[PDB]
Design a protein around this ligand. Structure first.
Ligand SMILES: [Mg+2]
Ligand SMILES: [Mg+2]
Ligand SMILES: [Mg+2]
Ligand SMILES: [Mg+2]
Ligand SMILES: [Mg+2]
Ligand SMILES: [Mg+2]
Ligand SMILES: [Mg+2]
Ligand SMILES: [Mg+2]
Ligand SMILES: [Mg+2]
Ligand SMILES: [Mg+2]
Ligand SMILES: [Mg+2]
Ligand SMILES: [Mg+2]
Ligand SMILES: [Mg+2]
Ligand SMILES: [Mg+2]
Ligand SMILES: [Mg+2]
Ligand SMILES: [Mg+2]
Ligand SMILES: [Mg+2]
Ligand SMILES: [Mg+2]
Ligand SMILES: [Mg+2]
Ligand SMILES: [Mg+2]
Ligand SMILES: [Mg+2]
Ligand SMILES: [Mg+2]
Lengths: 134, 260, 182, 171
RNA sequence: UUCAUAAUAACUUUUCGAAUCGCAUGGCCUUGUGCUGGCGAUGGUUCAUUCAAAUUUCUGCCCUAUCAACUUUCGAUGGUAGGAUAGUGGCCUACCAUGGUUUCAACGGGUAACGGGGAAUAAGGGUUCGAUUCCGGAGAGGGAGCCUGAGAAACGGCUACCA
RNA sequence: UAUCUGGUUGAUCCUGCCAGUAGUCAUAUGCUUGUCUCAAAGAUUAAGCCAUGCAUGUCUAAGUAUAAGCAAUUUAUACAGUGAAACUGCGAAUGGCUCAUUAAAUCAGUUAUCGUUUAUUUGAUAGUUCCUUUACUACAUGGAUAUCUGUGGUAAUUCUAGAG
């Protein structure tokens, strides 16, 4: 009796992004929130699209279960998703890896260190070696 | 401030922008452009808010960068381009065109214009001056400095711009008895049938204007914009025709036209 | 630099702090309506004061004035929709006599009891705080909820929770588990 | 370690205000003057390092200056500069006379040569023709517009003369 | 309007009027590397437009008269002319005149006073507060000086004095 | 949200305050303290002083490339891919903080700029640069300078001296 009931509202086809956008309402009796990836699959098979070219988020369930609301898009192609969706949701859907970044303070300190020096670091290596040597 | 100001805080943006005073601290300031930033409407608000075509400023920048919006036949890829009054916005995607006309309440309501009459434009002359080498030029509210106009065109007039090349098509002379459209202050967005022009020589000429339902009101000259001769508006009015029904009739027609 | 999120106050403490008859009356209304803190009565009296102030302001001007007409009809429409004042006294002047009891009548536990399901309205209050009642497939843990007339027909139990045909829950279940096991 | 400035004509160190153009200082921010200390021009004992240019060759060869030769670092880049460097008969297609740097990454031999500026491509002539043709087209269009406007005003002036004549004859 | 614009005369230690980049590289055949053509990007004179910037009219600022005359040799009020300004202007300079404000509170003193949109308070009338979510103004220890730049008397920009 | 009550006298009426009362986007402080939503916050005394860290840097197909950097596999004889550094241009005059100075000063409403400057943004705009056009580069005029390579100076500073 699970019967995850997905329905779409306020959909419009926006070819500017090469997309169809809509708001998702999900009716799930005696069950908690419904695991976005499952919604990706259900919508993709619904609009006859790939599980990749769909992107849904914003799932907030109402106070007391039963129904939940989120916001979903279905892209024309997977490449549309690759080129038109912020990368954090790509990592969420696993299509793209999470780009590694040193902590922001690390980057800022390194930038200040670079600003400290005028030009490249090749000219200071041997010079400082000689200076400490002599 | 020692020099120009570049940041616009979210409260300072005009109310007609329909912005959310929540969900953000700033407001998109229009760049320098053909319109006053108090009066204009940036493409960001037009797309992200009014039409709900893009959720976030980033993909709005994406739509702008792909050269799909077309203002007056030009790409205008700026994300905060101040596309002002009754410019035309073309989207070859969906192949659909809009004209930015104030609604009856005043704000920039969307007006679905069809293609063929989306070609041209209407402009209010702000000055007529003899330029260098004795060349007469006319300048409109758009700032479109049109060269060599018909010599009998004068101030306060409406001129038909091709928007293909940038040349005049036709023009309407300002006088009494003429369908006019109001663009400032209390009577913003109203449509009228001018009955009187009144001088107070030396400053702030007024006009007494009659609506479609014999309700007269008087307004300054600078907020007045002719739209056609009585009964045939040169440009399709937005739905409602700016008749300015009073609030009681708003609720009465909401109750009369009730269906949910 | 961030836009102010406005807020407000929603009650009015009385001028006289300890006059007897008023104390007895408040405690009365608390008794037959199961109120938690005196601030409750103070709140409803606050909305009632707002309504009387608006009504006096409107009655000040002549009948058939535009603002009078629009504002008064909107107010009485809100009042009938919320179901406090009758449908026969749609007059904008009977809304002078409310007698704060009437607003309390539309309270959620009060309407629960007057429909039943309660057995000592106090029980209803508890039930409200126990997430067992829904306004047409929507639970409400809020004792007041200021139930409006149209949806009053659909105040019932929820599909989830006991009393509405669901899993017994956390005490009878554990007793049954202990009885089966031992 | 204080550097000396040319044109101080002094055997001592002096505080001085400097900006762009002068040596002894580099302006980080645009157009910022800085007051810095610089050594004078007269040489005494108090100088740690002397940067001397040797002008004429001497009798005694010095081991590490004259017999060896540091290779000239980077060849000319502008086309006229290359022609002048090689003396290359101006209409000699200097394109192929550039000094190639074949670089060996260790296993793959690749090419690397400077891009010549000021080179007379057909593209530059294309641009020149474009500019000239557009300018002439615009000037002619403006002349046409002026002609049409003059014709229009002649027509209107004739109409107004006819009207005034009609009024004068009528009254 | 001595405005726009035009015209005549001359002047200029002669300003600008493309020696700049991407893509695509079509057509003519003068069949050569020949002549030619697009969509662009940057610059570029002038005038508009916009973002502004300055100055500016009227009217409106709390307490104090145990502050009633104040301002003008050093600019106070006005004139002329010039300088300087981006531009009006004692803005400054030279020569003139003697004016300017004030019991309708000037000038002076205090403000634990940034002004304002406002907040608290509430029969009506008011009283108090407003450092601060918005708008202006001022400042970056205190004062002065200045380069760059359309824009600063900048301060995470300089120069000097003082602490 | 038009309300009063206690105290002078042996007692009564009054003028009067004092006190009681109710708020406070007014703070301080005490005692307490379970949940949701929301959220002020070194302003008052010191516009007093600050260690340390960060808070403005930016490159597109399109301004400059021989990084003796990667790329080098499938686009590669002038280079053409990517891309440090540096030159160039642009912004750094916005934002943010604070309320010391300031009393027709700032500011508000309303005016004017026929009295001015205005990068940018958008519209437009320029045949003449010839100077006796029968001896001129226009199929493209010159020299520098960074980065860099190398020798360095100071105890240290976003210090920079010299040569190519
Ligand atoms: Mg600022
Ligand atoms: Mg003139
Ligand atoms: Mg003068
Ligand atoms: Mg104040
Ligand atoms: Mg304040
Ligand atoms: Mg502020
Ligand atoms: Mg300042
Ligand atoms: Mg300090
Ligand atoms: Mg600049
Ligand atoms: Mg300063
Ligand atoms: Mg600063
Ligand atoms: Mg500095
Ligand atoms: Mg006595
Ligand atoms: Mg006694
Ligand atoms: Mg008291
Ligand atoms: Mg809980
Ligand atoms: Mg402080
Ligand atoms: Mg590249
Ligand atoms: Mg730079
Ligand atoms: Mg203060
Ligand atoms: Mg102060
Ligand atoms: Mg004073």
């Amino acid at each position: 009796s699970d019967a995850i009931t997905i329905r779409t509202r306020k959909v419009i086809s926006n070819p500017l992004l090469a997309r169809k956008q809509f708001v998702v309402d999900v009716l799930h009796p005696n069950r908690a929130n419904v695991s976005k990836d499952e919604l990706r699959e259900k919508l993709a098979e619904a609009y006859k699209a790939e599980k990749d070219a769909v992107s849904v988020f914003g799932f907030r369930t109402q106070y007391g279960g039963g129904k939940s609301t989120g916001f979903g898009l279905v892209y024309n192609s997977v490449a549309d998703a690759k080129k038109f969706e912020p990368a954090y949701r790509l990592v969420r859907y696993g299509l793209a890896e999470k780009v590694e970044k040193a902590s922001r303070q690390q980057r800022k300190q390194r930038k200040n260190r670079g600003k400290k020096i005028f030009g490249t670091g090749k000219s200071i290596a041997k010079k400082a070696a000689r200076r400490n040597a002599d | 401030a020692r020099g120009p100001k570049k940041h616009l805080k979210r409260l300072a943006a005009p109310h007609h922008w329909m912005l959310d005073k929540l969900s953000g601290c700033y407001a998109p300031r229009p760049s320098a452009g053909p319109h006053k930033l108090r009066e204009s409407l940036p493409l960001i608000v037009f797309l992200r808010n009014r039409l709900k075509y893009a959720l976030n400023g980033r993909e709005v920048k994406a739509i702008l960068m792909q050269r799909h919006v077309k203002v007056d036949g030009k790409v205008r890829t700026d994300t905060t381009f101040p596309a002002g009054f009754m410019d035309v916005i073309t989207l070859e995607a969906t192949n659909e065109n809009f004209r930015l006309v104030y609604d009856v309440k005043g704000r920039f309501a969307v007006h679905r214009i069809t293609d063929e009459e989306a070609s041209y434009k209407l402009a209010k002359v702000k000055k007529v001056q003899l330029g260098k080498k004795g060349i007469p030029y006319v300048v409109t509210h758009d700032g479109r400095t049109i060269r060599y106009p018909d010599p009998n065109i004068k101030v306060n007039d409406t001129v038909k711009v091709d928007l293909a090349t940038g040349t005049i098509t036709d023009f309407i002379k300002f006088d009494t008895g003429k369908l006019v459209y109001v663009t400032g202050g209390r009577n913003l967005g109203r449509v009228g049938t001018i009955v009187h022009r009144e001088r107070h020589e030396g400053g702030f000429d007024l006009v007494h204007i009659k609506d479609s339902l014999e309700n007269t009101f008087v307004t300054r000259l600078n907020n007045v914009f002719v739209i056609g001769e009585p009964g045939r508006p040169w440009i399709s009015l937005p739905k409602g025709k700016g008749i300015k029904l009073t609030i009681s009739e708003e609720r009465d027609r909401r109750r009369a036209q009730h269906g949910l | 630099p961030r836009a102010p999120r406005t807020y407000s106050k929603t009650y009015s403490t009385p001028k006289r702090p300890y006059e007897s008859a008023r104390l007895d009356a408040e405690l009365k209304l608390a008794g037959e309506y199961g109120l938690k803190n005196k601030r409750e009565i103070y709140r409803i009296s606050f909305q009632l004061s707002k309504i009387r102030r608006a009504a006096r302001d409107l009655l000040t001007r002549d009948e058939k004035d535009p603002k009078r007409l629009f504002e008064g009809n909107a107010l009485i429409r809100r009042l009938v929709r919320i179901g406090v004042l009758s449908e026969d006294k749609k007059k904008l002047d009977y809304v002078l006599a409310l007698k704060v009891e009437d607003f309390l009548e539309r309270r959620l536990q009060t309407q629960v009891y007057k429909l039943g399901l309660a057995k000592s309205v106090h029980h209803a209050r508890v039930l409200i705080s126990q997430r067992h009642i829904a306004v047409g497939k929507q639970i409400v843990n809020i004792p007041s909820f200021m139930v409006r007339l149209e949806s009053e027909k659909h105040i019932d139990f929820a599909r989830t929770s006991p009393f509405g045909g669901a899993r017994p829950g956390r005490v009878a279940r554990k007793r049954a588990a202990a009885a089966g096991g031992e | 370690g204080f550097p000396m400035k040319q044109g101080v004509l002094l055997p001592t160190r002096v505080k001085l205000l400097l900006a762009k153009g002068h040596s002894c200082y580099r302006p980080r921010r645009n157009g910022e003057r800085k007051r810095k200390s610089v050594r004078g021009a007269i040489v005494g004992p108090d100088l740690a390092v002397l940067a001397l240019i040797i002008t004429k060759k001497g009798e005694q060869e010095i081991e590490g200056i004259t017999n060896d030769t540091v290779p000239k670092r980077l060849g000319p880049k502008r086309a006229n500069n290359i022609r002048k460097f090689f003396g290359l008969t101006k209409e000699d297609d200097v394109r192929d006379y550039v000094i190639r740097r074949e670089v060996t990454k260790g296993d793959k031999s690749y090419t690397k040569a400077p891009k010549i500026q000021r080179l007379v491509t057909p593209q530059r002539l294309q641009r020149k023709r474009q500019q000239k043709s557009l300018k002439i087209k615009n000037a002619q269009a403006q002349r046409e517009a002026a002609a049409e406007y003059a014709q229009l005003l002649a027509k209107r002036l004739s109409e107004r003369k006819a009207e005034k004549a009609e009024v004068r004859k009528r009254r």
